[PDB]
């Protein structure tokens, strides 16, 4: 019926709202994760930090690198595993 159809619009809106909330949360979580290495490497001086997807310990205590502190948007694999993200990414750029 008319009301039976109408009652689905707000449900669609809420589902898209949850979808966007989860997308934003994954975005923020990986944004803080790919940097928590640098949070753990900067702050018994701790110079043994990194990721599991790029981190390593060949360096010594005398150096201080920032290539892990500055990361590009071509590393968020948990985001790139979606259709909407790559769609809007290629649409913007």
């Amino acid at each position: 019926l008319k009301a039976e159809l109408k009652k689905s619009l707000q449900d669609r809106r809420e589902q898209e709202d949850t979808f966007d909330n989860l997308q934003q949360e994954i975005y923020d979580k990986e944004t803080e994760y790919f940097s928590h290495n640098s949070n753990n490497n900067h702050s018994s001086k701790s110079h043994y930090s990194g990721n599991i997807i790029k981190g390593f310990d060949t360096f010594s205590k005398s150096h201080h690198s920032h290539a892990d502190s500055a990361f590009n948007n071509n590393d968020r694999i948990f985001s790139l595993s979606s259709a909407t993200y790559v769609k809007q990414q290629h649409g913007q750029s």
């Binding site: 159809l5 669609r12 589902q15 979808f19 949360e25 994954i26 990721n51 599991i52 979606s82």
Partner: protein
């Protein structure tokens, strides 16, 4: 090579980029093993053989259905792990394929629970599993592996008659033996290999044995052990001297066949397939050195398969199975050695003509006889295509080349070693392993067995729980050294010192902290997937009803 595995540039140019223009209005073995000339082999292109047959009576068809006893404690712990012998809860074939290949039946996965979650397990079952796992720390995630034998079927009867009064069953015997070997594995994993003291003790034992009885394996010749197939003492980044850990032989990577060095500990073929038990080389009496299997399982020396002219390897990178024993010369087997005078194996002969004094290869190396590979390489010497080529050269006692010092002392050394061997053929100190290096199970294992017999609720006397602990160390000796259970773990802590273990813990901490953030991201991803699935499913239906109200 035949005319299916060579190339197409043995055509005229036909570069395959040039364009071709299509239009419209029984057995061909073509060449020989290797370089030669064209030849047809339709007689060698043969496939058939005798047959294959189908058995008419199943294993479960031959079984005495009688059952004299039952258990009165934790029957569910048995019915879970073994096969509960009734008509259990089954499904119908008109539904099974629709349920496990249907519109919502996914593929399987190496992580999909080894149990069947569609059926339920009771809570008494889980409580019983917790009770059992609480017997000892090394009993977490337990499963009965051991398998029953035609001699254990006899031991069981004597145990039932003497101690347990027709209460012990096959399943409980298998469980007791499986627990015994699980505990022995966990005791063995942590034995520390050596330190400076034991290293000095072993090197001095080796040198003082060589000084009197001579050696062949490279031990005792110097402070740094040499190779065991070519007596080499140099190394480099392309092939290194890789030591073993059961025995203490050394080898070159390309002289033995080590295509890649594992990151943990290296175990040779004899200490990997069987155990270090003093095996039987087919061709010489002494059994100490680098061994390799044949095409059937026996164990022949690498120094022997090379020098015997009828023996070769079938793969020159792995040095895999020694081949060509079934066509050794009857005269070769009828010869008899002259330094140890033993009547076993096959020998080689002197080189200089008008001499027919024979000797085994290892007895020759022990005595000190002149042997030189020449300018050949190990790989050519192994390949057996050396026959049409030149030859390798040795000498007997009284045919030594100029400068080759006396070896009468050498033959005396060898005879003394074999004579002592033949004679030996016929702060509280506790002995804990048989002379053949097999184990003997201590008090704690009997205590664990008593606790398990309590768990299952049988009349348990300590004598009855020490009898099995005796019989274990003898069933593990009848078998040669191989563990009675098919299980084994690749872990080797062993030779690690203290600071190294400290650093390993420190790094494991970091990886452990990291995997948690990873797991958080993973579950976020899973939630997003579910959300988008539901969104699409609702959107399809709403757009359908909008595009068609009927």
């Amino acid at each position: 090579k035949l005319r299916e595995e060579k190339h197409f540039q043995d055509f005229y140019p036909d570069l395959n980029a040039d364009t071709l223009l299509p239009f419209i209005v029984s057995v061909q073995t073509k060449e020989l093993i290797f370089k030669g000339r064209v030849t047809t082999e339709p007689l060698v292109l043969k496939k058939n053989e005798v047959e294959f047959q189908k058995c008419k009576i199943t294993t479960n068809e031959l079984k005495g259905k009688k059952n004299p006893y039952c258990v009165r404690f934790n029957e569910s712990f048995i019915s879970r792990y073994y096969h509960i012998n009734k008509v259990r809860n089954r499904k119908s074939y008109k539904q099974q394929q629709k349920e496990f290949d249907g519109v919502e039946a996914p593929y399987f996965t190496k992580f999909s629970s080894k149990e069947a979650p569609n059926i339920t397990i009771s809570t008494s079952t889980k409580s019983a599993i917790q009770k059992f796992a609480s017997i000892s720390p090394n009993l977490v995630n337990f499963k009965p592996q051991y398998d029953m034998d035609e001699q254990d079927e006899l031991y069981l009867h004597y145990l039932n008659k003497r101690y347990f009064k027709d209460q012990m069953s096959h399943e409980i015997f298998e469980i007791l033996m499986t627990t015994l070997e699980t505990e022995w594995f966990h005791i063995e994993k942590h034995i520390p290999s050596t330190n400076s003291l034991i290293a000095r003790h072993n090197i001095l034992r080796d040198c003082k044995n060589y000084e009197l009885y001579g050696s062949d394996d490279g031990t005792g010749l110097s402070m740094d052990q040499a190779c065991a197939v070519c007596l080499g003492t140099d190394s480099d980044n392309l092939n290194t001297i890789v030591f073993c850990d059961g025995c203490d032989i050394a080898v070159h990577q390309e002289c033995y066949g080590i295509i890649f060095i594992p990151e943990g500990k290296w175990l040779c073929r004899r200490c990997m397939i069987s155990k270090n038990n003093f095996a039987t080389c087919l061709m010489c009496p002494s059994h100490t050195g680098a061994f390799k299997q044949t095409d059937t399982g026996s164990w022949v020396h690498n120094i022997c398969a090379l020098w015997l002219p009828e023996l070769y390897f079938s793969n020159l990178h792995y040095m895999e199975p020694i081949e060509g024993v079934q066509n050794v010369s009857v005269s070769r087997w009828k010869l008899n050695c002259y330094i140890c005078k033993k009547k076993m194996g096959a020998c080689i002969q002197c080189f200089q003509r008008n001499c027919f004094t024979a000797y085994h290869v290892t007895c020759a190396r022990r005595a000190g006889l002149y042997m030189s590979k020449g300018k050949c390489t190990i790989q050519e010497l192994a390949s057996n295509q050396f026959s049409q080529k030149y030859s390798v050269e040795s000498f007997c006692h009284k045919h030594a080349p100029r400068g080759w010092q006396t070896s009468i002392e050498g033959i005396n050394k060898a005879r003394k070693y074999f004579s002592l061997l033949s004679t030996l053929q016929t702060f509280n100190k506790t002995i804990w392993k048989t002379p053949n290096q097999t184990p003997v199970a201590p008090h704690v294992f009997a205590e664990i067995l008593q606790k398990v017999v309590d768990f299952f609720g049988l009349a348990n006397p300590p004598a009855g729980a020490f009898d099995i602990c005796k019989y274990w160390s003898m069933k593990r000796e009848l078998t040669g050294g191989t563990p009675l259970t098919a299980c084994f773990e690749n872990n080797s802590l062993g030779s690690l010192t203290e600071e190294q273990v400290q650093t390993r813990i420190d790094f494991a901490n970091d990886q452990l902290e990291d995997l948690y953030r990873l797991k958080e991201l993973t579950t976020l991803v899973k939630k997003r997937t579910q959300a988008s699935n539901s969104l699409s499913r609702s959107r399809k239906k709403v757009f359908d009803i909008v595009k068609s109200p009927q």
